[PDB]
Symmetry: C2
Subunit: 125 residues, 2 copies
Amino acid sequence: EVQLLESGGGLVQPGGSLRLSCAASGFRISDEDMGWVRQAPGKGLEWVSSIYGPSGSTYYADSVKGRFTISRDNSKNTLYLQMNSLRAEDTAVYYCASALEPLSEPLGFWGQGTLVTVSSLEALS
Amino acid sequence: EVQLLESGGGLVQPGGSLRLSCAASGFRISDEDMGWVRQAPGKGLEWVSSIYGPSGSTYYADSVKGRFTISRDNSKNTLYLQMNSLRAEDTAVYYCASALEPLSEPLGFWGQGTLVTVSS
């Protein structure tokens, strides 16, 4: 029973920061290629970041390079996403997900999704 | 720039059929691994189907086994999703996905998405 439970989303002002968390149950995060996918209306889906090849190599989108940081905690079996210097363009629903071809399961699995919103004082008023 | 253009969505009656098409740009679907994701109203994204491996092996979710069929056409370089015996729960926004690994690690790509409404 592979399960990914997400946490950490919320409302933040530009320049703020969040730490998205995704706890896995049923398998070790130290063995799968994990990542984060953003979803926004009129934007489809895009891979934000990913950690792969338990040598531990990280991919980042050009939009989030230098600001986002993907991490693993094998003790707690949790994937982390540090999101500093947030922008209005980072507003979306983030999903922790496996690769298209998982090592454990024959088909990929997703998290439930966490809404992360970045809005300024002028946009809210 | 690798792109995935979806088409074929719309309204279908329960028990009907439909064929979602995804035209690829920047690569050949013959060598890559691809798949179909869907997002149901009030629910998160879910992997509908996939095709990967050197075997061309296909895999489906328990909800769509026997009813959905993923396939590739090298003639038009298009990924097809045949959906028969559509239920009301098949109403969703469908995206096509691909994985391209030119530098030893896969890179995920998605499409814009198309809406499929199984309504009476």
